[PDB]
Coordinates of C-alpha atoms and ligand atoms in Angstrom, one line a residue:
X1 CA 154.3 53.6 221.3
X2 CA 156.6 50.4 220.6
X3 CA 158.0 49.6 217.1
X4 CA 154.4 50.1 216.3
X5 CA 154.3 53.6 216.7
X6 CA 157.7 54.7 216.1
X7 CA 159.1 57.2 213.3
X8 CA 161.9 54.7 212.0
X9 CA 159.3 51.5 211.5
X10 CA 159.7 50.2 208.0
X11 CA 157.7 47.5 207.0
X12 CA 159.3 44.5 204.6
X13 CA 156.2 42.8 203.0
X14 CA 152.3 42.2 203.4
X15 CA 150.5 39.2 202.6
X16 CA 147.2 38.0 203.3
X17 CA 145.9 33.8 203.1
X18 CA 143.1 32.1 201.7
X19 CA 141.5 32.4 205.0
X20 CA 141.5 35.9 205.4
X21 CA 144.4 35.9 208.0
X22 CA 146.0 39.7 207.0
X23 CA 150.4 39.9 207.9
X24 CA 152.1 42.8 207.7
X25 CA 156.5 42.3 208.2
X26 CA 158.9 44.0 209.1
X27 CA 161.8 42.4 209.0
X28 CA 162.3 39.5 212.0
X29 CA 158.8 39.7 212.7
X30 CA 155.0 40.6 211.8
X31 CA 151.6 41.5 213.3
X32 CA 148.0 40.2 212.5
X33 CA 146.1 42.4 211.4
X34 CA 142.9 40.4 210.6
X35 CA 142.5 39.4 214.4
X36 CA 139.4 40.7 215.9
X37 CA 141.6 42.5 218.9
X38 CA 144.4 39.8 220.0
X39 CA 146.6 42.3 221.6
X40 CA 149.4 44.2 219.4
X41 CA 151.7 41.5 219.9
X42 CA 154.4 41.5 217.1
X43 CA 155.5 37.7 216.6
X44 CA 159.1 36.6 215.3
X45 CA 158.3 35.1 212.1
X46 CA 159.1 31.2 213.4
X47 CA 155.6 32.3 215.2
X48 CA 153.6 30.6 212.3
X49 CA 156.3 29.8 209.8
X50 CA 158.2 27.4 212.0
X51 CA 161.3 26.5 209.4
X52 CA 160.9 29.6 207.4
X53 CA 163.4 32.2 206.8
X54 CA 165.0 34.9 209.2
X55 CA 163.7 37.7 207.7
X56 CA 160.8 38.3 204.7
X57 CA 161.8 41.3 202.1
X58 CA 158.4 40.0 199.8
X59 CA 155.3 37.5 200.1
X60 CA 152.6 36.6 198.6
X61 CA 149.7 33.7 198.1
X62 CA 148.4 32.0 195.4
X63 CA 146.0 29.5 195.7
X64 CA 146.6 27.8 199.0
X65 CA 150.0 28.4 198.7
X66 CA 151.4 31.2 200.7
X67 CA 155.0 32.8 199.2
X68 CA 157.9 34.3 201.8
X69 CA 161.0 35.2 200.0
X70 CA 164.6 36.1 201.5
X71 CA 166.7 37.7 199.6
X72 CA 167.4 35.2 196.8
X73 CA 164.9 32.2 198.7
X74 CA 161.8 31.6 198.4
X75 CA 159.7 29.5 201.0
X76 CA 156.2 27.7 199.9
X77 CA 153.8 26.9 202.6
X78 CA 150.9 24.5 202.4
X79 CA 148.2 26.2 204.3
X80 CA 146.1 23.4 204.7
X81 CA 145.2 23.7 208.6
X82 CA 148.7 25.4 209.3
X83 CA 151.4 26.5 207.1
X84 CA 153.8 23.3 206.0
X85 CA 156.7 24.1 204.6
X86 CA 156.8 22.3 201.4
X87 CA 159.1 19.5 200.3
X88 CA 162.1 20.7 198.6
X89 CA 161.8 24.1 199.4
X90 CA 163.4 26.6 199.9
X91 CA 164.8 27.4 196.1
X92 CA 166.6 30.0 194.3
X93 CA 163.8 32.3 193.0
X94 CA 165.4 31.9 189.2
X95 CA 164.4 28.2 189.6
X96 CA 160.8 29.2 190.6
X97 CA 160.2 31.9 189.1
X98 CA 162.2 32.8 186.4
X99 CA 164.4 36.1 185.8
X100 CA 163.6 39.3 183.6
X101 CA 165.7 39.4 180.7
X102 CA 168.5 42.1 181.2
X103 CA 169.0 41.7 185.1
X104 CA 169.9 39.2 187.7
X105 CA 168.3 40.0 190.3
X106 CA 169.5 40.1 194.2
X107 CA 166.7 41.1 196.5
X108 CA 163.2 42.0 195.4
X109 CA 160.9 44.5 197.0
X110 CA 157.5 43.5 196.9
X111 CA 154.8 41.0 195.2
X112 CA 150.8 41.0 195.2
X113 CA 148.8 38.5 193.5
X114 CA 145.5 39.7 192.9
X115 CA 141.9 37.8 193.9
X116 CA 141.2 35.7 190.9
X117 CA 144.3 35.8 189.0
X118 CA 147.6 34.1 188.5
X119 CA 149.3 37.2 187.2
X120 CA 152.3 37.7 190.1
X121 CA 153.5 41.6 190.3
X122 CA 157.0 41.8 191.5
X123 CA 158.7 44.8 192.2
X124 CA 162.6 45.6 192.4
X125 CA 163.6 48.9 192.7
X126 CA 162.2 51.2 190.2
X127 CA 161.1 47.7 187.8
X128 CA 157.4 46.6 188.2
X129 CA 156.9 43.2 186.4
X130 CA 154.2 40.9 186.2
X131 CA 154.9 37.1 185.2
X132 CA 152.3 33.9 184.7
X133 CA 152.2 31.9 187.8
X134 CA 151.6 28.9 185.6
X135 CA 154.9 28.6 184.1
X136 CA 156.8 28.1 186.5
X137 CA 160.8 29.1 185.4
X138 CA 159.8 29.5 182.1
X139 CA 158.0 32.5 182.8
X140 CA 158.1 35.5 181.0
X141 CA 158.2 38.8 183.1
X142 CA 157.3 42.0 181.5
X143 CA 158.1 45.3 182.5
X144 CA 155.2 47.5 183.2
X145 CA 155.0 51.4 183.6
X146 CA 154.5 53.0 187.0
X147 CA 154.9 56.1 189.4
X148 CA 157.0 54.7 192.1
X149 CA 160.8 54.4 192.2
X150 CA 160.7 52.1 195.0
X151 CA 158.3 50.2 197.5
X152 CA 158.8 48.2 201.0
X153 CA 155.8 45.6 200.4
X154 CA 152.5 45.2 198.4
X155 CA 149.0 43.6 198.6
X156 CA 146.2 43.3 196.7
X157 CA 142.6 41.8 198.5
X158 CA 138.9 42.8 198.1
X159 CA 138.5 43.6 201.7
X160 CA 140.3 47.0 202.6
X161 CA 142.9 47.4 205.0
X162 CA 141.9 49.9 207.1
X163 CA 138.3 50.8 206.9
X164 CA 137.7 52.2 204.2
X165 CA 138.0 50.7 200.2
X166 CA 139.2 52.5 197.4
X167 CA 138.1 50.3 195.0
X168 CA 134.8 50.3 194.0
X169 CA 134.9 46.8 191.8
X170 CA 137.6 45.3 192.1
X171 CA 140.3 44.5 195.2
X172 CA 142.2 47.0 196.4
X173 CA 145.7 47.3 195.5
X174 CA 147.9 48.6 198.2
X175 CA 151.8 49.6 198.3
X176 CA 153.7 50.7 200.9
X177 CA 156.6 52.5 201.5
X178 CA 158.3 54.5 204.8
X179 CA 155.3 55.7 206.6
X180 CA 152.9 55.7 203.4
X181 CA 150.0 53.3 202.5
X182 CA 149.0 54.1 198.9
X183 CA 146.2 52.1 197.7
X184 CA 144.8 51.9 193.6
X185 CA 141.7 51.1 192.5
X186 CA 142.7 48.8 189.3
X187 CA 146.5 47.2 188.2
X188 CA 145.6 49.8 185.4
X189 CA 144.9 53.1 187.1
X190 CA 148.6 51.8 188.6
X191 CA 150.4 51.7 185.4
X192 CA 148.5 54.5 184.7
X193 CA 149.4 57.0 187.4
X194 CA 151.4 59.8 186.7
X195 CA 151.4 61.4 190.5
X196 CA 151.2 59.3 193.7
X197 CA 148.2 59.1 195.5
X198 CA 147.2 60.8 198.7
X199 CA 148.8 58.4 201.2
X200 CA 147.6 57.2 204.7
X201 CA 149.6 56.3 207.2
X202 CA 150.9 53.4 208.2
X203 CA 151.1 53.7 211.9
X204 CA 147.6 54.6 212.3
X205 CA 146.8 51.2 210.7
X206 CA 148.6 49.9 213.1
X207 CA 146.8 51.3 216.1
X208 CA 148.8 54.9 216.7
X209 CA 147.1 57.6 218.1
X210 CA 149.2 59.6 215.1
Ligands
CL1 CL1 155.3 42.1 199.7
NA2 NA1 159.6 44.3 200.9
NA3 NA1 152.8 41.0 199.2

């Protein structure tokens, strides 16, 4: 093969919960990854995220908070014993978030927030940023260094996606984009990079035969 399998599939976003529970988008809808064997299934995004938005371009969790933004949006779930949409939402990202300093930004590519930090990377383009969680709209983002011009989705966990780690300490960081799965072992080794790393594919991750 379905979507799953096919040459044109372009994933939107990744993000995993405080449970464990692993998504990966792609547009309208998602699949579990973290299941045990539930079937293939993609779900429209309403699925699990009953009053959500149509379509996620970035997402990630912080806390036991899970973030899906649209476009401009972003959508804050409670996920107590289910996601809950929280009270006032969706914003403007500005108002959550904050802006970078030069640009006003439209869409926005991907986000990871690593295990045991409040650091949020978002990515735009050919701009990686990371920003405080903990101040809100008054955060600061600063532009960091990196080997990619542009991403689909991002995700940082200690488990590995797939079976196999890359990390040896840390979480692995994984970023995505067309049919590639690239995965760091460190924020660092990412700013770091010169060269991308051998990728894996996507659609084996999702249970292709290719
Ligand atoms: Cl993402
Ligand atoms: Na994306
Ligand atoms: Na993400």
């Amino acid at each position: 093969e379905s979507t799953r399998c096919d040459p044109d599939l372009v994933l939107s976003a990744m993000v995993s919960d405080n449970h464990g529970a692993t998504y990966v988008f792609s547009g309208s809808h998602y699949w579990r990854l973290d299941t045990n064997r539930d079937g293939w299934h993609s779900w429209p995004i309403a699925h699990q995220w009953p009053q959500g938005p149509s379509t996620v371009d970035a997402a990630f969790s912080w806390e036991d908070k899970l973030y899906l933004i649209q476009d401009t949006k972003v959508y804050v779930f409670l996920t107590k014993g289910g996601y809950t949409l929280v009270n006032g939402y969706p914003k403007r990202l500005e108002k959550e978030l904050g802006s970078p300093p030069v640009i006003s930004l439209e869409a926005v590519d991907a986000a990871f927030v690593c295990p045991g930090s409040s650091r949020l990377h978002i990515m735009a383009g050919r701009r990686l940023w990371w920003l405080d969680l903990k101040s809100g709209a008054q955060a600061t983002w600063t532009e960091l260094p990196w080997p990619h011009e542009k991403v689909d989705g991002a995700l940082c966990m200690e488990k590995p996606l797939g079976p196999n780690s890359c990390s040896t300490s840390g979480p692995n960081l994984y970023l995505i984009h067309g049919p590639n799965l690239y995965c760091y072992r460190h924020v660092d080794k990412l700013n770091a990079a010169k060269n991308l790393p051998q990728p894996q594919r996507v659609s084996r991750l999702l249970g292709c035969t290719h």
